[PDB]
């Protein structure tokens, strides 16, 4: 195939340009995002029961739905929580690779069969079923700078005028509104109600009767009478539209004739559907949108379009309405693209330099400058053909492939330059001879490298999804690289290189270059003299090799392992939790203090604080909240002390002095959709007839016993909420029956007053919205207010609540947890300093086994991935070893010579382990993929060394030692040229600080050290490897030459 293209260099050019055309084309049209789909597919069922408590929610909604969640494919596990805000969420998580749309449809189909069994109050609120494992594209905040709007006013403008054209924008999928649209709020007065002998029941019945829409037929309706001349719609009643029309609802015409209007027993105002969440952006009221990327959508194009359509609404905004952006992944993505491209373009420059240093002509420096981008561009087209996107893992997989694509260009050009120099051949005839020396090895290298990187793509779960991104990216670029090395670069070698006179090594050049050529000629002679020397006593260095292996083992077992480096993402989180029973106003002062902190003591760094009063990450309640801190640009936070990690420590320290609360700040994980990474995730399950009380017991048992192994577990604790005091009120069935007061009149009076009641729909400015009746706040705060509510008996007397009810104080859960259909409490925690999480789990399992009978357990989340994926790495890489050996056995036509190549593996591994242990980094996915790329490059060096030596003995008849020193002499310059450019090219990554430098440091350090020792050691060790192997497996006359 080369020869065909040495003879047709424009054909080879045309194929390269077409490959470049497809690649640059694919770049323009490919989806871009921070990360691909890594978290396993999850579907979330959300339902709302207004005024209900955690127990009522769980036992009329949660359990009903859960018992119908069978017959669903690829389900991994199911978990749910029901809390005192009347909110239930049921998340179903499926195996990696499950079609998310198939999963959601089977969930929805099953959830549906159960809808007729839910209470009408839950059905009327709308049970949602959504894909919830997608990450956030951006967070939009909405404020009014004129100070003329409460958060409910903002929330209603967002819903009515903003939220839907946002769900329509290019590429967006799933948008969450902070707050609700307007609800017609009927704020009832109990004193005025009793004084007119009315109850909430009569209010609700009046709204349901006077706020109605009536189908009334037609004058001239069909079928009409003969000779009818008029046909017109009959309009009878229409939904009310304003506080005033609701105000004049005729509740009752009194005895004297006076009218009881609705405004005579209630305040009436447009309000929120719900008041459990206070949202503040820099201490001001706010609403907003949480926006997610649709699967396989371009994040760059979706955010840019979103910011353009809000810009198409801003003229029509009310005065002072301001759009703000506390979160947006787009800049961190663009910085990543810029850094990877910069790493690529400057790695090309370093190759042009090292090319000109060793070959000394601007003509041979052009060839790798052409081939490498051709492969880089073309890799994008291969990624499009297989459905991949431009993301962090694929882009870094391309920089981890730079050393391999560069070597393909060097080895081809350097060999033509050497054959021309050592033999005076013209470029065309030398290119033909050089390709005959390496084309069989290049093909064989493609198979060996395939066997190194392809097994990665078959790990399971979220981590297998990560490795597969590197695996496919690197194999694709590698396969393309070889194709280019067989098509374009030989055509370019024959047509662009000028002839070199035979024996001319440039030792007679002037100045710096002539000094360079003489010194490298000396150094090569010393190298072969050395390698001559080492080859005389090989048993000494077979022992040195054994020491390097045992040391690599010791360094590997001693190095801690992690998931993905933490990145300064320009944002972070701080969480607030008050004791039980704490109110909304108490948490607000804390958040106002956490707010006030950031915009003063961190004035230079923090750009904004988005505080939420009502939900935290342990659950929902009045005693919880969080504040989202959006930093300033990384450019304006120079130095260690201005990074998210440092800003989060100074935060948490100064929130130690806060007394009424308990406040931490923390950074986001690299993959936020996954969370976790660190520690374990444990579930304690009630499997017999135990209760929430016997379960919290065995939990505290397990928590206390774990706290007595601080050598093993640290920070074990619950994920959920502790029992809080609740007001148990009992209805006396005997008295209410005696006073003629019906139970149904009692329960809807209590519920609608203290919990609120969705009644029906009105129409606000043309948009249908809800109508809520609920007591005015002042008459529904304390237990003494219970007495001020009256219910009508069948005879007509007002009977106070005190006349048929008693009450006490008791304890109850404000957030109940279920796992796989049974009661549960989630217990987080991690492994102690210098301990494995795999063994931290084994203790958690042992502790849980001594718990009371009927209490079981299970692992979930990140931990569930481990328990079913530890057996994988050994087998997968045992398959890699076997195929690599078999491929080398095919390339060399020998069962033994492959061993001379495979022994180079630890030579680079120890360098990565040393550079990682030095820098205090972790075995992470970037480090492991860099291990493979390092191992692959060293194997490529050994393969070509061994192939040159074996061909010298085979085709030219030389003996072991002459061929070994000869091959290793020709291979010294290419091996050094590549490593010099690669080690220099990975330089900005190892020292990187700032955004993205977490991943950059990770791919840089291990590759750097691995590159250094691989080249230092293998140049001396694989000549030993070939000789010792060729001596043990031999039969006759191989140390001596032959014809």
């Amino acid at each position: 195939m080369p020869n065909f293209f040495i003879d047709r260099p424009i054909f080879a050019w045309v194929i390269a340009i077409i490959i470049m055309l497809a690649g640059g084309l694919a770049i323009l049209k490919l989806p871009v995002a921070q990360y691909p789909t890594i978290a396993p597919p999850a579907v979330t069922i959300s339902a709302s029961y207004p005024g209900a408590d955690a127990k009522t929610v769980q036992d009329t909604v949660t359990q009903v739905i859960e018992q119908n969640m069978n017959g669903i494919d690829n389900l991994m596990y199911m978990s749910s929580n029901s809390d005192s805000t009347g909110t239930v969420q049921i998340t179903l998580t499926f195996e990696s690779g499950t079609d998310a749309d198939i999963a959601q449809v089977q969930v929805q189909n099953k959830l549906q069969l159960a809808m007729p069994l839910l209470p009408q109050e839950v059905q009327q609120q709308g049970v949602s079923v959504e894909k919830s494992s997608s990450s956030f594209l951006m967070v939009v905040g909405v404020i009014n700078t004129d100070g003329t709007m409460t958060q409910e006013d903002i929330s209603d403008y967002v819903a009515a005028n903003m939220k839907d054209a946002i769900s329509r924008t290019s590429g967006v999928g799933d948008v969450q509104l902070f707050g609700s649209q307007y609800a017609m709020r009927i704020w009832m007065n109990p004193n005025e109600l009793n004084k007119f002998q009315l109850t909430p029941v009569d209010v609700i019945t009046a709204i349901k009767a006077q706020n109605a829409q009536v189908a009334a037929g037609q004058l001239g309706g069909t079928p009409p009478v003969k000779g009818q001349q008029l046909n017109a719609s009959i309009i009878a009643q229409t939904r009310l539209t304003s506080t005033e029309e609701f105000g004049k609802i005729l509740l009752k015409v009194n005895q004297d004739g006076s009218r009881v209007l609705l405004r005579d027993v209630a305040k009436i105002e447009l309000g929120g559907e719900n008041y459990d969440i206070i949202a503040e952006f820099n201490g001001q009221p706010a609403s907003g949108l949480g926006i997610k990327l649709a699967t396989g959508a371009n994040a760059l194009d979706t955010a840019a379009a979103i910011r353009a359509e809000l810009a198409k609404m801003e003229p029509f905004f009310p005065s002072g309405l301001k759009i703000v952006y506390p979160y947006d992944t787009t800049p961190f993505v663009k910085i990543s693209i810029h850094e990877v491209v910069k790493t690529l373009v400057e790695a090309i420059i370093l190759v042009f330099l090292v090319m000109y240093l060793f070959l000394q002509n601007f003509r041979a420096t052009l060839i790798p400058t052409i081939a490498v981008p051709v492969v880089l561009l073309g890799t994008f087209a291969v990624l499009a053909a297989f459905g991949f996107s431009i993301n962090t893992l694929t882009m870094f997989g391309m920089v981890l492939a730079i050393g391999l694509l560069v070597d393909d260009a060097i080895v081809v050009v350097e060999n033509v330059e050497r054959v021309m120099a050592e033999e005076g051949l013209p470029p065309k005839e030398a290119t033909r001879k050089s390709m005959g020396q390496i084309q069989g090895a290049l093909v064989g290298i493609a198979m060996v490298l395939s066997a190194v990187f392809v097994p990665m793509a078959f790990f399971g779960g979220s981590t297998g999804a990560i490795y597969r991104q590197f695996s496919i990216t690197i194999v694709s670029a590698m396969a393309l690289s070889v194709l280019v090395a067989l098509i374009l670069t030989p055509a370019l070698c024959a047509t662009m290189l000028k002839p070199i006179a035979k024996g001319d090594h440039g030792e007679g050049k002037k100045g710096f270059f002539g000094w360079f050529n003489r010194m490298f000629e000396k150094s090569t002679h010393h190298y072969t003299d050395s390698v001559g020397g080492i080859l005389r006593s090989t048993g000494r260095y077979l022992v040195l090799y054994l020491i390097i292996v045992v040391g690599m083992a010791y360094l590997f077992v001693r190095l801690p392992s992690s998931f993905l480096p933490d990145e300064d993402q320009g944002v972070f989180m701080t969480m607030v939790q008050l004791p039980a029973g704490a109110t909304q106003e108490r948490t607000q002062k804390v958040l106002n203090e956490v707010t006030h902190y950031y915009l003063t003591k961190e004035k230079n760094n923090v750009e904004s604080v988005f505080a939420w009063n009502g939900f935290g990450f342990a659950g929902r309640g009045q005693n919880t909240g969080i504040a989202f801190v959006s930093l300033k640009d990384w450019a304006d936070r120079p130095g260690e002390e201005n990074k998210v990690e440092a800003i989060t420590m100074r935060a948490t320290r100064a929130f130690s002095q806060i007394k009424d609360a308990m406040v931490f700040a923390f950074n986001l994980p690299a993959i936020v959709e996954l969370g976790t990474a660190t520690g374990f995730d444990f579930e304690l399950i009630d499997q017999a007839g135990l209760g929430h009380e016997k379960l919290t017991q065995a939990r505290n048992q397990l928590l206390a016993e774990a706290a007595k192994h601080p050598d093993m577990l640290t920070s074990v604790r619950p994920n959920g909420l502790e029992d809080t005091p609740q007001f148990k009120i009992d209805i006396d069935q005997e008295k209410a029956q005696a006073l003629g007061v019906s139970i149904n009149d009692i329960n809807t009076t209590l519920g609608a007053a203290w919990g609120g009641s969705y009644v029906n729909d009105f129409i606000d400015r043309g948009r249908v919205k809800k109508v809520y009746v609920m007591s005015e706040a002042k008459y529904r705060m304390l237990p003494d207010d219970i007495g001020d509510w009256y219910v009508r008996a069948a005879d007509g007397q007002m009977v106070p609540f005190s006349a048929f009810s008693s009450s006490r104080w008791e304890y109850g859960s404000p957030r109940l947890e279920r796992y796989n259909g049974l009661p549960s409490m989630e217990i987080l925690g991690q492994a102690a300093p210098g301990k494995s999480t795999g063994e931290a789990m084994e203790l958690m399992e042992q502790l849980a086994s001594k718990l009371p009978t009927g209490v079981g357990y299970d692992w979930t989340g990140m931990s569930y991935q481990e328990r079913l994926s530890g057996n994988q790495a050994p087998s997968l890489y045992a398959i890699s070893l076997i195929v690599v050996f078999l491929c080398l056995a095919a390339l060399y036509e020998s069962w033994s010579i492959p061993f001379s190549v495979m022994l180079v593996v630890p030579l680079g591994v120890i360098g990565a382990l040393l550079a990682a242990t030095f820098r205090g980094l972790t075995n992470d996915v970037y480090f492991q993929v860099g291990l493979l790329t390092t191992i692959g490059l060293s194997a490529k060096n050994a393969i070509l060394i061994v192939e040159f030596a074996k061909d010298l003995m085979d085709k030219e008849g030389k003996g072991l030692i002459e061929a070994t020193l000869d091959a290793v002499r020709m291979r010294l310059r290419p091996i050094l040229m590549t490593s010099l450019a690669f080690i220099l090219g990975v330089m900005p990554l190892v020292i990187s600080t700032g955004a993205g430098s977490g991943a950059q440091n990770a791919v840089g350090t291990g590759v750097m050290g691995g590159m250094v020792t691989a080249t230092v050691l293998a140049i001396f060790f694989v000549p030993v490897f070939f000789v010792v192997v060729r001596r043990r497996f031999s039969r006759k006359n191989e140390d001596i030459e032959h014809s």
């Binding site: 008693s806 009450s807 006490r808 304890y811």
Partner: protein, 150 residues
């Protein structure tokens, strides 16, 4: 300061940390937003030893919450016989009425505690006291069908 660290230490059943906090001069009679004292917590949850360490340290044995219930109410309602005894031996009002007029006899008679009823009766529990609905401990028993209590 420590009146709060004691309620949670008494709700958790942490003996030494209660004993350490009594040594730190923590108020035996501290109460939360619903009027529950460390004795209220220890009686509700069933911690005998902390009922003994608090009472030995001068804990109000007849403390009532914002609805009128006492540690004997909780201990008699929920079956802690030994704590019903230890409360009663330390001067617990055996006939105390909450804001609904419910006595520890009413509570223990509802759920079917036969032992705690007898221990209350020995310590002079009014068999005929009434709640706000006129009901006595006997009326409760015939309602529940508990032939033993009747």
């Amino acid at each position: 300061d420590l009146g709060k660290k004691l309620l949670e230490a008494a709700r958790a059943g942490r003996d030494d940390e209660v004993r350490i906090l009594m040594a730190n001069g923590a108020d035996v009679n501290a109460a939360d937003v619903v009027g529950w004292t460390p004795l209220h917590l220890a009686a509700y949850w069933g911690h005998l030893e902390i009922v003994e360490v608090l009472l030995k340290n001068g804990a109000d044995v007849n403390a009532y919450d914002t609805l009128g219930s006492t540690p004997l109410h909780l201990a008699a309602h929920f079956g802690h016989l030994e704590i019903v005894e230890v409360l009663l031996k330390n001067g617990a009002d055996v006939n105390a009425k909450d804001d609904n007029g419910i006595t520890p006899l009413h509570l223990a008679a509802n759920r079917g505690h036969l032992e705690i009823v007898e221990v209350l009766l020995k310590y002079g529990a009014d068999v005929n006291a009434q709640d706000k609905f006129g009901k006595t401990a006997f009326d409760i028993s015939i309602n529940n069908g508990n032939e033993d209590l009747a």
